[PDB]
Amino acid sequence: PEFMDTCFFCGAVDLMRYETLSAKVPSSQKTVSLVLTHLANCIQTQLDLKPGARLCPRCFQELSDYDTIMVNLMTTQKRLTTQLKLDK
Amino acid sequence: PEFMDTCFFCGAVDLSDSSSMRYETLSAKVPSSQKTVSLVLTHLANCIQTQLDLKPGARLCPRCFQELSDYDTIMVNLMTTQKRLTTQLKLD
Ligand SMILES: [Zn+2]
Ligand SMILES: [Zn+2]
Ligand SMILES: [Zn+2]
Ligand SMILES: [Zn+2]
Protein backbone atom coordinates (compact mmCIF):
# COMPACT_ATOMS: atom_id res chain seq x y z
CA PRO A 1 0.00 0.00 0.00
CA GLU A 2 2.24 2.85 1.47
CA PHE A 3 2.94 5.84 -0.92
CA MET A 4 5.32 8.06 1.13
CA ASP A 5 5.84 11.84 1.98
CA THR A 6 9.12 13.91 2.35
CA CYS A 7 9.61 17.47 3.74
CA PHE A 8 11.42 19.89 1.34
CA PHE A 9 12.65 21.62 4.62
CA CYS A 10 13.83 18.13 6.28
CA GLY A 11 12.53 14.34 5.90
CA ALA A 12 10.28 11.28 5.67
CA VAL A 13 6.78 10.16 7.13
CA ASP A 14 4.74 7.48 5.15
CA LEU A 15 1.78 9.98 5.60
CA MET A 16 -0.98 15.48 10.54
CA ARG A 17 -1.04 15.57 6.63
CA TYR A 18 1.82 17.28 4.55
CA GLU A 19 1.20 20.69 2.84
CA THR A 20 1.76 21.96 -0.78
CA LEU A 21 3.62 25.32 -1.03
CA SER A 22 0.33 27.05 -2.20
CA ALA A 23 -1.02 26.41 1.38
CA LYS A 24 -1.77 29.76 3.11
CA VAL A 25 -0.15 30.82 6.42
CA PRO A 26 -3.01 32.06 8.64
CA SER A 27 -1.96 35.51 10.00
CA SER A 28 -1.11 37.12 6.55
CA GLN A 29 -3.08 34.60 4.38
CA LYS A 30 -0.04 34.66 1.96
CA THR A 31 1.24 31.36 0.47
CA VAL A 32 3.93 29.47 2.43
CA SER A 33 5.98 29.64 -0.83
CA LEU A 34 6.17 33.42 -0.21
CA VAL A 35 7.45 32.95 3.40
CA LEU A 36 10.19 30.59 2.02
CA THR A 37 11.23 33.16 -0.68
CA HIS A 38 11.31 35.70 2.24
CA LEU A 39 13.82 33.60 4.25
CA ALA A 40 15.88 32.89 1.03
CA ASN A 41 16.00 36.67 0.57
CA CYS A 42 17.11 37.23 4.22
CA ILE A 43 20.34 35.23 3.28
CA GLN A 44 20.83 36.64 -0.22
CA THR A 45 19.75 33.48 -2.20
CA GLN A 46 17.37 32.10 -4.85
CA LEU A 47 15.21 28.99 -4.21
CA ASP A 48 13.97 26.40 -6.72
CA LEU A 49 10.45 25.28 -5.73
CA LYS A 50 9.52 22.18 -7.91
CA PRO A 51 5.71 21.65 -8.17
CA GLY A 52 6.54 18.37 -6.25
CA ALA A 53 7.48 20.08 -2.93
CA ARG A 54 5.54 19.27 0.29
CA LEU A 55 6.07 20.31 4.01
CA CYS A 56 5.84 18.23 7.22
CA PRO A 57 3.25 19.67 9.66
CA ARG A 58 6.17 20.70 12.06
CA CYS A 59 7.79 22.95 9.39
CA PHE A 60 4.40 24.32 8.20
CA GLN A 61 3.84 25.38 11.88
CA GLU A 62 7.39 26.91 12.17
CA LEU A 63 6.74 28.95 8.99
CA SER A 64 3.17 29.84 10.08
CA ASP A 65 4.60 31.07 13.48
CA TYR A 66 7.32 33.19 11.82
CA ASP A 67 4.71 34.84 9.53
CA THR A 68 2.53 35.32 12.65
CA ILE A 69 5.45 36.98 14.61
CA MET A 70 6.26 39.12 11.50
CA VAL A 71 2.56 40.31 11.32
CA ASN A 72 2.12 41.07 15.04
CA LEU A 73 5.56 42.89 14.91
CA MET A 74 4.43 45.12 11.96
CA THR A 75 1.01 45.89 13.56
CA THR A 76 2.36 46.70 17.12
CA GLN A 77 5.04 48.85 15.33
CA LYS A 78 2.30 51.01 13.67
CA ARG A 79 0.25 51.21 16.96
CA LEU A 80 3.44 52.59 18.68
CA THR A 81 4.77 54.92 15.93
CA THR A 82 1.28 56.54 15.39
CA GLN A 83 1.14 57.08 19.19
CA LEU A 84 4.59 58.76 19.02
CA LYS A 85 3.17 61.25 16.33
CA LEU A 86 0.16 62.22 18.68
CA ASP A 87 -0.35 65.30 21.07
CA LYS A 88 -0.11 65.78 24.93
CA PRO B 1 7.08 63.05 48.16
CA GLU B 2 4.28 65.53 46.73
CA PHE B 3 5.49 63.41 43.66
CA MET B 4 4.09 64.31 40.12
CA ASP B 5 5.43 62.04 37.27
CA THR B 6 4.40 62.63 33.58
CA CYS B 7 4.65 59.92 30.88
CA PHE B 8 6.87 60.89 27.87
CA PHE B 9 4.79 58.69 25.51
CA CYS B 10 1.07 59.04 26.51
CA GLY B 11 1.24 62.15 28.78
CA ALA B 12 -0.50 60.42 31.77
CA VAL B 13 0.27 62.25 35.08
CA ASP B 14 0.34 60.37 38.39
CA LEU B 15 -0.07 62.37 41.71
CA SER B 16 1.46 60.51 44.76
CA ASP B 17 1.47 61.27 48.58
CA SER B 18 2.46 55.65 47.58
CA SER B 19 1.97 52.64 45.08
CA SER B 20 3.56 49.28 43.71
CA MET B 21 5.20 49.02 40.10
CA ARG B 22 5.20 52.80 39.03
CA TYR B 23 6.93 55.20 36.56
CA GLU B 24 10.32 54.25 34.89
CA THR B 25 13.46 56.28 33.82
CA LEU B 26 14.37 55.85 30.08
CA SER B 27 17.45 53.85 31.35
CA ALA B 28 15.18 51.05 32.71
CA LYS B 29 16.05 47.93 30.63
CA VAL B 30 13.40 46.07 28.55
CA PRO B 31 13.30 42.55 29.92
CA SER B 32 13.77 40.11 27.02
CA SER B 33 16.75 41.90 25.28
CA GLN B 34 18.16 44.34 27.87
CA LYS B 35 18.53 47.28 25.43
CA THR B 36 17.62 50.47 27.32
CA VAL B 37 14.01 51.60 26.68
CA SER B 38 15.44 54.89 25.27
CA LEU B 39 16.94 52.64 22.46
CA VAL B 40 13.48 51.06 21.80
CA LEU B 41 12.07 54.69 21.43
CA THR B 42 15.03 55.99 19.28
CA HIS B 43 14.25 52.85 17.14
CA LEU B 44 10.53 53.82 16.83
CA ALA B 45 11.45 57.43 15.88
CA ASN B 46 13.69 56.04 13.06
CA CYS B 47 10.72 54.03 11.69
CA ILE B 48 8.88 57.38 10.86
CA GLN B 49 12.20 59.21 9.93
CA THR B 50 11.98 61.50 13.00
CA GLN B 51 14.19 61.77 16.15
CA LEU B 52 13.50 62.88 19.76
CA ASP B 53 14.84 65.18 22.49
CA LEU B 54 15.13 62.70 25.42
CA LYS B 55 15.33 65.57 28.02
CA PRO B 56 17.23 64.15 30.97
CA GLY B 57 14.49 63.65 33.65
CA ALA B 58 11.88 62.01 31.24
CA ARG B 59 9.63 59.20 32.59
CA LEU B 60 7.18 56.41 31.46
CA CYS B 61 3.84 55.17 32.83
CA PRO B 62 3.93 51.38 33.52
CA ARG B 63 1.44 50.67 30.66
CA CYS B 64 3.64 52.41 28.05
CA PHE B 65 6.73 50.65 29.56
CA GLN B 66 4.86 47.34 29.36
CA GLU B 67 3.89 48.10 25.70
CA LEU B 68 7.52 48.96 24.63
CA SER B 69 8.73 45.89 26.69
CA ASP B 70 6.42 43.64 24.57
CA TYR B 71 7.39 45.15 21.19
CA ASP B 72 10.98 44.37 22.26
CA THR B 73 9.87 40.82 23.21
CA ILE B 74 8.26 40.35 19.68
CA MET B 75 11.34 41.71 17.82
CA VAL B 76 13.46 39.13 19.85
CA ASN B 77 11.16 36.24 18.82
CA LEU B 78 11.69 37.55 15.24
CA MET B 79 15.58 37.72 15.72
CA THR B 80 15.78 34.10 16.99
CA THR B 81 13.06 32.46 14.83
CA GLN B 82 14.76 33.99 11.76
CA LYS B 83 18.34 32.72 12.84
CA ARG B 84 16.72 29.22 13.15
CA LEU B 85 14.73 28.93 9.83
CA THR B 86 17.45 30.53 7.58
CA THR B 87 20.08 28.24 9.23
CA GLN B 88 17.54 25.44 8.39
CA LEU B 89 17.44 26.65 4.74
CA LYS B 90 21.32 26.54 4.53
CA LEU B 91 21.36 22.72 5.13
CA ASP B 92 20.05 22.28 1.45
ZN1 LIG C 1 1.63 20.61 -6.52
ZN1 LIG D 1 9.97 19.32 7.75
ZN1 LIG E 1 2.34 56.29 29.11
ZN1 LIG F 1 17.01 60.53 35.12
Curated annotation (Swiss-Prot), chain B:
Residue stretches in coiled coil: none
Tissue specificity as recorded in UniProt: Predominantly localized to the sub- and supraesophagal ganglia and the ventral nerve cord in the embryo, after dorsal closure.
* ZAD domain ranges (all copies): 4-90
Domain of life of the organism encoding this protein: Eukaryota
Summarize where Zn(2+) binds, as residue positions.
C7, C10, C61, C64
Localization, UniProt: Nucleus
Q: What does this protein do?
A: Transcriptional activator that controls bicoid gene expression during oogenesis. Found in transcriptionally active cells. Binds to specific sites on polytene chromosomes of third instar larvae. Binds to the consensus DNA sequence 5'-YTAGAGATGGRAA-3'.
What does the subunit section of this Swiss-Prot or TrEMBL entry state?
Homodimer (via ZAD domain) in solution. Binds DNA as a homodimer. N-terminal regions of the protein are required, in addition to the zinc fingers, for the specificity of chromatin-binding.
Question: What is the name listed in the Swiss-Prot or TrEMBL entry for this protein?
Answer: Serendipity locus protein delta
Native source organism of the sequence? Drosophila melanogaster (Fruit fly)
What gene makes this protein?
A: Sry-delta
Q: Which residues of the full protein are shown?
A: 1 to 90 of 433
